[PDB]
Amino acid sequence: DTHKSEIAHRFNDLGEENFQGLVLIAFSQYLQQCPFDEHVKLVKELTEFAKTCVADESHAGCDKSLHTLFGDELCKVATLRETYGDMADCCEKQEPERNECFLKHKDDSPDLPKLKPEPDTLCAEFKADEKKFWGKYLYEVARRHPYFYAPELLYYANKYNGVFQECCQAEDKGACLLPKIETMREKVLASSARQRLRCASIQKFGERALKAWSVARLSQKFPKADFTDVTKIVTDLTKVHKECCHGDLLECADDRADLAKYICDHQDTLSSKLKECCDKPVLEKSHCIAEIDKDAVPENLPPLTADFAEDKEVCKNYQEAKDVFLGSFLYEYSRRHPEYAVSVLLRLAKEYEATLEDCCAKEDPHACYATVFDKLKHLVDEPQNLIKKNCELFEKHGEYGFQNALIVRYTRKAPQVSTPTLVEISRSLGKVGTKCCAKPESERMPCTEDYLSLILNRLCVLHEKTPVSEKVTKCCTESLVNRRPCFSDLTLDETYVPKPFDGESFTFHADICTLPDTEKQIKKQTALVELLKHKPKATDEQLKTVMENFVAFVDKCCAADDKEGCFLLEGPKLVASTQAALA
Ligand SMILES: O=C(O)c1cc(I)cc(I)c1O
Ligand SMILES: O=C(O)c1cc(I)cc(I)c1O
Ligand SMILES: O=C(O)c1cc(I)cc(I)c1O
Ligand SMILES: O=C(O)c1cc(I)cc(I)c1O
Ligand SMILES: O=C(O)c1cc(I)cc(I)c1O
Ligand SMILES: O=C(O)c1cc(I)cc(I)c1O
């Protein structure tokens, strides 16, 4: 829904508080390096102009696009050419391409401090100015995660203030805040990863890909809903996601608020779980609906074969209404199977598609696809088998050893990838074992597939920035729903030529001794990646042996009276024993 004067329309619809937040988020994601108070000045300016348009729409500029108003306001700043050399040229053009320049200049790995929460500090800041405190959270998160879902960011910022309203009056503040903050952080990072993937899917694969994921996903949430209604909500949600992924943040939030009201209006025909969401204020209500659990499979549904294998008009429908037919298949399969990962359901519908494209060209099509459902079942078996093998490994070795196995796997599959990225990604992938291996059957397939999709998407995002591996290129571009199976099926990349051991290639030193154990591990895991890059054909055993000798070497030297001496002296011995082990 567009008005002639969009600034007024969205300020009217959103209220000042949320309008300002979204403006601040917008400024923070387009210009991730600029100071807080710079953006804050621009937000206040925009709010005033918003007000004048609400009072009088005929007044000059009020009919401007929001892109125009936002971008002009960003291009107030005199020199940030120094900060954005590649993007200082953005202010040199206009809509719609000035916006597209901003968009392409978002940094997925900004050079920004992992900020340590400091309780006394943050509590003081809360007291001085809690509005500034809320805004600061928006700016710090939005600048680090420039595709963060803007209306959920407001939700999290209200929750963050909530933690401080509670905790900063307690006798012990650290003990109060900290566990709430680490808990919230994990949810925030999860949200950031989900939205990064939604935007990546829109960007690389078209909104149709997101549309498909959401038909499957919503059919599991709202299985008693009819297909008309699931389609109407997916259309609306897809528009919201596309808005937020394109920086149309005020539209994004206004449209998500309307959808929330639509869903709560129809709660009786969607899910009984919505009762818990539907009396909440707007951001909370949207959050709660977005997080809703899967509903019970409705009773007495027909066999799938009726509409998709028996009916004489199968090939007719595929032909004359392809996307509605395949959407229908996704809804009907999804509503019958909440224990299916959404990615598995999308793979079933892809193979069903391929089966008709093949069969509907035959003299007797039904003879050809009669058994399609019988055949689909391997798409369920394959992941269940992979889950069972990998949780066994996790169970026998724990998270660290599991991350080590994964480092070994991914360095073999993509040895061209930067050592920090192989380590970051491998570590992330290993956490699926803690997250998911102890879940029951109802939930273990969705937990693993969802979580692995998020992490492989991070890899794809990093790989797109500087392409190095032909195989990773393949798995990241071939097909979104086959991404995970693609990465799982990559083998050791023999195209890669190791660069030899020069002698003393990677050297541990005394500064390692004083690091927190997490950091010590990462140093060892980096050592491991580097070993594999020199000896890309090393066996599992040889890698186990060298890693044990690494662990022994650091433990021993960090215990020495003279630590650096130990390193310098015992270094060569380790090099020699290693060389003789890798022969
Ligand atoms: O930081 C402030 O002082 C501030 C003030 C206002 I008024 C609105 C937002 I968002 C802010 O961040
Ligand atoms: O994103 C963070 O790193 C983060 C940092 C702090 I301090 C508090 C919360 I909640 C966070 O999510
Ligand atoms: O992802 C959302 O933001 C979302 C928002 C609403 I409102 C409803 C559903 I289902 C969602 O998935
Ligand atoms: O490594 C995999 O290929 C893998 C795939 C699936 I699906 C589940 C788990 I746990 C895994 O470890
Ligand atoms: O502990 C493991 O399960 C493990 C497995 C492999 I494969 C390689 C290394 I180094 C390991 O530490
Ligand atoms: O929640 C989503 O809408 C979502 C969308 C895609 I595309 C992939 C994953 I994992 C998701 O969780």
Q: 15 burial class (0-12, 13-18, 19+ CB within 10 angstroms)?
A: exposed
Residue 581 located in a structural domain: no
Radius of gyration of the chain (CA): 27
Q: In this structure, what DSSP letter does residue 306 have? A: I
End-to-end CA distance of the chain, in Å? 69
178 and 270 within one domain: no
Structure tokens at 292: 């809703």
164 and 97 within one domain: no
Report which of 94, 53, 47 is spatially closest to residue 75, judged by C-alpha positions. Answer: 94
Q: Find the CATH number of the domain harbouring 192.
A: 1.10.246.10
Per DSSP, the three-state class of 339 is: coil
How many beta carbons lie within 10 A of that of residue 341, not counting itself? 25
Contact 135, 22 (CB under 8 A): no
- Residue 178 CA to residue 183 CA, distance in Å, equals 8
- What is the greatest pairwise CA distance in the chain? 84
Residue 262 located in a structural domain: yes
- Residue 5 CA to residue 7 CA, distance in Å, equals 6
- Residue 356 CA to residue 373 CA, distance in Å, equals 12
- Residue 214 CA to residue 270 CA, distance in Å, equals 15
401 and 331 within one domain: no
- Residue 414 CA to residue 417 CA, distance in Å, equals 6
- Residue 142 CA to residue 39 CA, distance in Å, equals 12
Taking the CA of 219 as reference, the closest ligand is 3
Q: 581 burial class (0-12, 13-18, 19+ CB within 10 angstroms)?
A: middle
Dihedral sign computed on CA atoms, order 184, 188, 189, 194: positive
345 and 395 within one domain: no
Residue 580 located in a structural domain: no
Ligand 6 atom at shortest distance from the alpha carbon of 450: 10
- Residue 65 CA to residue 479 CA, distance in Å, equals 35
- H/E segment holding residue 351: helix 342-359
- Residue 477 CA to residue 470 CA, distance in Å, equals 11
- The torsion angles phi and psi of 299, rounded to 5 degrees, stand at -80, 150
Write 10-16 long-range contacts (CB < 8 A, 24+). 10/66, 10/250, 10/251, 10/254, 11/47, 11/50, 11/51, 11/53, 11/54, 12/54, 13/254, 13/257, 14/250, 14/253, 14/254, 14/257, 16/47
- Is 357 annotated to bind ligand? no
- Is 108 annotated to bind ligand? no
- Residue 166 CA to residue 163 CA, distance in Å, equals 5
Taking the CA of 404 as reference, the closest ligand is 5
Residue owning the nearest CA to atom 12 of ligand 3: 290
Residue 428 located in a structural domain: yes
- Residue 356 CA to residue 365 CA, distance in Å, equals 8
Go through 498-513 and write b for each residue having 16 or more CB atoms within 10 A of its CB, e for each that does not: eeeeeeeebebebebb
Of 259, 276, 295, the one marking the end of a domain is: 295
Residue owning the nearest CA to atom 2 of ligand 3: 290
Q: 255 burial class (0-12, 13-18, 19+ CB within 10 angstroms)?
A: buried
46 C-alpha to ligand 1 centroid (Å): 12
186 C-alpha to ligand 1 centroid (Å): 26
Residue owning the nearest CA to atom 9 of ligand 4: 387
127 C-alpha to ligand 1 centroid (Å): 14
Number of residues assigned to the chain: 583
Structure tokens at 378: 């391997």
448 and 358 within one domain: no
Ligand 4 atom at shortest distance from the alpha carbon of 341: 7
- Is 6 annotated to bind ligand? yes
Ligand 3 atom at shortest distance from the alpha carbon of 151: 3
239 C-alpha to ligand 3 centroid (Å): 11
150 and 78 within one domain: no
Residue owning the nearest CA to atom 5 of ligand 2: 185
Ligand 1 atom at shortest distance from the alpha carbon of 135: 12
Structure tokens at 526: 């980096």
91 and 124 within one domain: no
Give resolution, Å, one decimal: 1.8
213 C-alpha to ligand 6 centroid (Å): 7
Experimental determination technique: X-ray
481 and 408 within one domain: yes
Of 477, 493, 509, the one marking the end of a domain is: 493
- Residue 514 CA to residue 491 CA, distance in Å, equals 38
386 and 368 within one domain: no
Contact 461, 320 (CB under 8 A): no
Report which of 534, 496, 483, 160 is spatially closest to residue 343, judged by C-alpha positions. Answer: 483
Report which of 379, 368, 95 is spatially closest to residue 247, judged by C-alpha positions. Answer: 95
**Residue 395 to residues 113, 156, 391, 399, Cα–Cα distance (Å):** 35, 34, 6, 9
Structure tokens at 245: 């992924």
Which amino acid is located at 187 in the chain? K
Per DSSP, the three-state class of 232 is: helix
Taking the CA of 489 as reference, the closest ligand is 4
Q: 213: Cβ below 6 Å to ligand 6?
A: yes
How many beta carbons lie within 10 A of that of residue 278, not counting itself? 16
Residue 391 located in a structural domain: yes
Pocket probe for ligand 6: among 199, 215, 256, 453, the residue whose CB has the most ligand atoms within 8 Å is 453
- Is 243 annotated to bind ligand? yes
Residue 70 located in a structural domain: yes
Residue owning the nearest CA to atom 2 of ligand 4: 488
**How many domains, in total, are found in the chain?**
6
- Is 285 annotated to bind ligand? no
Task: Measure CA 69 to chain center.
Answer: 30
Which amino acid is located at 219 in the chain? S
- Residue 579 CA to residue 41 CA, distance in Å, equals 61
- Residue 314 CA to residue 319 CA, distance in Å, equals 9
- Please tell me whether the peptide bond between 96 and the residue prior to it is cis, using omega within 30 degrees of 0: yes
234 and 181 within one domain: no
486 and 507 within one domain: no
Go through 166-181 and write b for each residue having 16 or more CB atoms within 10 A of its CB, e for each that does not: ebbeeeebeebbeebb
The domain of 533 spans: 494-571
How many beta carbons lie within 10 A of that of residue 515, not counting itself? 13
**Residue 297 to residues 339, 346, 376, 384, 583, Cα–Cα distance (Å):** 10, 19, 20, 21, 58
Go through 419-455 and write b for each residue having 16 or more CB atoms within 10 A of its CB, e for each that does not: bebbbbbbbbbbebbebbbeeeeeebbbbbbbbbbbb
Residue 420 located in a structural domain: yes
Pocket probe for ligand 3: among 202, 229, 285, 289, the residue whose CB has the most ligand atoms within 8 Å is 289
Structure tokens at 310: 């028996």
Residues within 6 Å of ligand 2 by CB: 115, 117, 141, 160, 181, 184-185, 188
71 and 1 within one domain: yes
Of 145, 163, 196, the one marking the end of a domain is: 196
Q: 264: Cβ below 6 Å to ligand 3?
A: no
- The answer for residues whose C-beta is within 8 angstroms of residue 388's C-beta and 6 or more apart is none
Residue 103 located in a structural domain: yes
Pocket probe for ligand 2: among 28, 181, 183, the residue whose CB has the most ligand atoms within 8 Å is 181
